[PDB]
Amino acid sequence: AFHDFQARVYVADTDFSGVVYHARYLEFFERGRSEFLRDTGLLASGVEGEKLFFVVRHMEINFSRPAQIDNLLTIKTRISRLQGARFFMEQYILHGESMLVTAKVEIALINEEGKPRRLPKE
């Protein structure tokens, strides 16, 4: 299923048209992905030899409706396909029952100098 996570819309999130600035949805999505991880089960720290990072390789986003200041938003995340050197996520931000933004995201793993690495046990 989709994991659920909520986030408040603040002033920092908006722009001069009164709505959430489009790029900021990528922030909320990212919160969805990190809280999805937390929900299951260090990379950055030094650990087994090198600092590793998740990196966004590809993103598709459809913006259909806006969020407003003060909206309590719902982020829904799940892994749509796992591949060993990369995984794929499907995400949606809603306000109650109303669908605001949809995304398909491609995530790979890299080290400090930006070299690809394979994925561990999940």
Q: Which residues bind a second copy (CB under 8 A)?
A: 8, 10-12, 14-19, 21-24, 26-27, 30-31, 34, 38, 44, 51, 53-64, 66, 68-70, 110, 112, 114
Query: In whole angstroms, what is the distance from residue 51 CA to residue 68 CA?
Result: 38
Question: Catalytic annotation on 13?
Answer: no
By beta-carbon proximity to a second copy, the closer residue of 79 and 110 is 110
**Cβ nearer to a second copy, comparing 72 with 82:** 72
Q: Least Å distance between CB 45 and a second copy?
A: 9
Query: What distance in Å separates the CA atoms of residue 122 and residue 45, rounded to the nearest whole number?
Result: 19
Asked whether the beta carbons of 21 and 11 are under 8 A apart, the reply is: no
Q: Are 93 and 117 in contact (CB under 8 A)?
A: no
Nearer CB in complex with a second copy: 59/79: 59
The answer to whether residues 9 and 73 touch, using CB atoms and an 8 Å cutoff, is: yes
Catalytic residue among 4, 15, 39, 70: 15
Q: Which residues are catalytic?
A: 15
